[PDB]
Design a protein around this ligand. Sequence first.
Ligand SMILES: *[C@@H]1O[C@H](CO)[C@@H](O[C@@H]2O[C@H](CO)[C@@H](O)[C@H](O)[C@H]2NC(C)=O)[C@H](O)[C@H]1NC(C)=O
Ligand SMILES: *[C@@H]1O[C@H](CO)[C@@H](O[C@@H]2O[C@H](CO)[C@@H](O)[C@H](O)[C@H]2NC(C)=O)[C@H](O)[C@H]1NC(C)=O
Ligand SMILES: *[C@@H]1O[C@H](CO)[C@@H](O[C@@H]2O[C@H](CO)[C@@H](O)[C@H](O)[C@H]2NC(C)=O)[C@H](O)[C@H]1NC(C)=O
Ligand SMILES: *[C@@H]1O[C@H](CO)[C@@H](O)[C@H](O)[C@H]1NC(C)=O
Ligand SMILES: *[C@@H]1O[C@H](CO)[C@@H](O)[C@H](O)[C@H]1NC(C)=O
Ligand SMILES: *[C@@H]1O[C@H](CO)[C@@H](O)[C@H](O)[C@H]1NC(C)=O
Ligand SMILES: *[C@@H]1O[C@H](CO)[C@@H](O)[C@H](O)[C@H]1NC(C)=O
Ligand SMILES: *[C@@H]1O[C@H](CO)[C@@H](O)[C@H](O)[C@H]1NC(C)=O
Ligand SMILES: *[C@@H]1O[C@H](CO)[C@@H](O)[C@H](O)[C@H]1NC(C)=O
Lengths: 48, 337, 241, 28, 49, 49, 49
Amino acid sequence: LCFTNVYADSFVIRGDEVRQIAPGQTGNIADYNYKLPDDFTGCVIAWN
Amino acid sequence: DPLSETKCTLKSFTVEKGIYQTSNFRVQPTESIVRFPNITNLCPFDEVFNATRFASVYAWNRKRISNCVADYSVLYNLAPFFTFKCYGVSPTKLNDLCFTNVYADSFVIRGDEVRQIAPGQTGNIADYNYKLPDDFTGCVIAWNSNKLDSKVSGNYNYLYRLFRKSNLKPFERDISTEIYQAGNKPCNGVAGFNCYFPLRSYSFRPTYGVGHQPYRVVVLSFELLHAPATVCGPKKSTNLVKNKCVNFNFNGLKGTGVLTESNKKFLPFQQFGRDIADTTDAVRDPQTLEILDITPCSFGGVSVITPGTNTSNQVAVLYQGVNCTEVPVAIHADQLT
Amino acid sequence: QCVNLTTRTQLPPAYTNSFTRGVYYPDKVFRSSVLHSTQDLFLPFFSNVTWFHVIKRFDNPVLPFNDGVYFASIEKSNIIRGWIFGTTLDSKTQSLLIVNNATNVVIKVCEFQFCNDPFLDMESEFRVYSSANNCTFEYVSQPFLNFKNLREFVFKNIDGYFKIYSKHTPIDLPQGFSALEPLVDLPIGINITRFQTLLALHRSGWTAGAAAYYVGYLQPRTFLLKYNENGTITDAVDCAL
Amino acid sequence: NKVTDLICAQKFKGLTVLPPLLTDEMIA
Amino acid sequence: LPVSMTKTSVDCTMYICGDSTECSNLLLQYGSFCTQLKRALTGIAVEQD
Amino acid sequence: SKFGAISSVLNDIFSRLDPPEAEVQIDRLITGRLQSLQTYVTQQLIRAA
Amino acid sequence: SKFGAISSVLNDIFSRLDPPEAEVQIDRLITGRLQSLQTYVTQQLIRAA
Ligand SMILES: *[C@@H]1O[C@H](CO)[C@@H](O[C@@H]2O[C@H](CO)[C@@H](O)[C@H](O)[C@H]2NC(C)=O)[C@H](O)[C@H]1NC(C)=O
Ligand SMILES: *[C@@H]1O[C@H](CO)[C@@H](O[C@@H]2O[C@H](CO)[C@@H](O)[C@H](O)[C@H]2NC(C)=O)[C@H](O)[C@H]1NC(C)=O
Ligand SMILES: *[C@@H]1O[C@H](CO)[C@@H](O[C@@H]2O[C@H](CO)[C@@H](O)[C@H](O)[C@H]2NC(C)=O)[C@H](O)[C@H]1NC(C)=O
Ligand SMILES: *[C@@H]1O[C@H](CO)[C@@H](O)[C@H](O)[C@H]1NC(C)=O
Ligand SMILES: *[C@@H]1O[C@H](CO)[C@@H](O)[C@H](O)[C@H]1NC(C)=O
Ligand SMILES: *[C@@H]1O[C@H](CO)[C@@H](O)[C@H](O)[C@H]1NC(C)=O
Ligand SMILES: *[C@@H]1O[C@H](CO)[C@@H](O)[C@H](O)[C@H]1NC(C)=O
Ligand SMILES: *[C@@H]1O[C@H](CO)[C@@H](O)[C@H](O)[C@H]1NC(C)=O
Ligand SMILES: *[C@@H]1O[C@H](CO)[C@@H](O)[C@H](O)[C@H]1NC(C)=O
């Protein structure tokens, strides 16, 4: 599939905050550092 | 203006002589009110979750939480994993809903058997020790217990059942330890073939793998009925307004309408009322105990009387079923016109 | 401690006909000038109800609790006091107990060392249970109270609760309609599979007043209820008669 | 005279009845 | 002999959704059923007269 | 009628579930109500004929 | 007609998979069969006219 543009948002978080980077999630990182919209489309890759 | 709305409804730039039904008018709400119970204590959540000395699967404890305030935000005081599945309700900050009666159950089970605590599952634990109904509403929480339920020789305080006469009805507890005879012979003996003692221990050893690790599980069972709602959540109240459009949240019931004093002979046990169309029509304020009648904001249809665009451009407007005094004057924006 | 009596005259239970009695409000919603349909545990219209009479005549048998109980009492001078509910009616299992004071009602649930014939005897004797094991639920409230008094009670035990509906009328059974208003909702949850009543007998052996009480059992049925201009049931129709 | 709250309940759900163009006097 | 029938009008949004706005937003995504229904009812109403 | 959803009122569906899952319930209720109103219109057309 | 579910026979589907999906498939079959009944009734009304 051919797309217009790709945005790569990179950050290093603790293990407990990994689930916070997801649609429909509430957390300190969600409301203070990084918020994802509900209609977000893409992928999230988190590795130790 | 009405002519442009007529053009948009007709999907044409020129309209002929006639009367056209364009849209509807309704008075848009102004303020917001919230009435919830007046209790101020906190629910015994911390006397079940931690529970140093804990329960077994075949004699699972049951706590009945009532007349308190429920704050589900204070749950992130444990190690992660916290599997956490709510059925019939979402937990994503939905602690803003009052509830009738809440049951709390708690037990330790094995690793691969945590999936068995769910409706529509068949398994040893599912049909021998604990079974949820098909249409269950509530939540299930699971977490690891290696740090607190580990012993060198393995703990024998934890047991489960493997053999019994038949399955279990939902929310049924079996404590019987009578022998289970299988083949043909009467048994009635302490041991022997077809003579089975219906209890087996877990024998949890830290040297085992993750799939064999003890998991501690708590199950919250909710109830929604025609009741005053004992348990509830931390939502602040608000002074109530009358004779004025207002969207409202009365003990968990959301609506929009004009709240007025009602003179319907409510009996002491009756909470709210209904009409012919099976809709709410009267509510009791759970802080002053006064019956209130609900009537939605004025609404109607609008028609545009116009001669042909080739003749003129001025129009007349007909509001259907309005007494020429209920036609709103509007302040800045309170109409869907 | 309880006493032994040998002044009883055994007699087979009598039977009579319940015409249209035993209709109660099934929900906590208000409806006016409406014909509604309900599907719940009711007492079928025109049914057998067992008749027990006390006046010597002394009857406190044990009766089952299949699904629910309809208890009527045509009475004067306030003989009947309360009830006991349980499975085995011994010390090994829990049981529920309701008694009326001179001006109070007390309800509590736990194991008992019941006698064979609990009873009450100006009264200063109350000989029901010889031992009070540890009890979970206790509750105290205002009293529930030619024959002139007609007390009607409906007892239900479903969904981990205990529903008591009651009605009182100043007057067999009278042919008429009278709905029952919810009065107690006590959430305990045992089986409750057999029950026995308690009356008051006073020494002259002993002399007991003329009292008649009626027992019936409920079944799942569909009913059509009529709500008048106010929220009062005026008539009902059984869709299975 | 021989041919004859529910209306309000129907109206509150969006179902309304429109009047005829010819009144009874005109038909008479 | 009967001649005329009662003229009725139906409001979509108040019947289907009621007092909910998000329901209206979803209802905008299901086509032009309401135009058809309103047009048919208006046709019947004119035919009566 | 519920048409297979969890309740017959929209506000309790929206206030008790996440938008991921409320859509199914709302869609099913909307489809049921649209079908009922369509049936009403068809019956009215036949009676008008 | 399966109407998009697993099998037309419902006694089979009630003894194959879990209640959470069996209820959904039974609901789908019920809706399809109700649609069939409505279509039959409407056609009968037109032929009766
Ligand atoms: C009403 O009846 C109850 C039931 O026996 C009485 O309660 C007892 O009261 C005495 C004195 O306070 C206690 O020692 C007993 O333990 C109570 N019984 C139970 C079962 O708890 C009560 O006294 C009576 N009179 C009232 C309430 O005025
Ligand atoms: C209510 O208590 C009775 C005990 O009297 C339980 O019923 C017994 O069930 C066993 C198992 O089938 C039978 O062998 C007994 O005969 C039953 N008792 C009687 C008197 O018939 C019953 O399980 C209890 N209800 C519960 C636990 O819900
Ligand atoms: C419904 O309630 C009204 C209000 O109390 C009842 O009307 C009263 O009835 C009593 C009994 O006959 C009269 O003494 C009062 O004068 C009535 N009040 C008024 C304002 O008329 C009415 O009877 C009730 N409907 C019933 C019981 O069917
Ligand atoms: C157990 O009780 C303590 C006492 O304050 C509380 O902090 C803790 O959260 C409780 N355990 C759990 C799992 O909530
Ligand atoms: C709290 O609410 C109850 C509800 O009936 C009311 O009786 C009481 O007066 C209220 N108290 C305060 C301080 O608002
Ligand atoms: C409309 O207003 C007039 C004037 O106040 C009043 O006489 C009449 O009864 C009203 N009609 C309705 C239907 O409210
Ligand atoms: C009185 O009845 C009880 C009931 O079991 C019995 O135990 C007791 O022995 C009886 N008293 C006498 C004196 O027989
Ligand atoms: C009531 O019981 C009697 C036997 O005592 C029986 O003859 C009669 O038919 C019963 N009535 C009904 C309605 O079953
Ligand atoms: C207290 O109640 C329990 C029921 O859980 C019972 O086993 C125990 O015997 C009771 N205590 C006494 C002293 O009877």
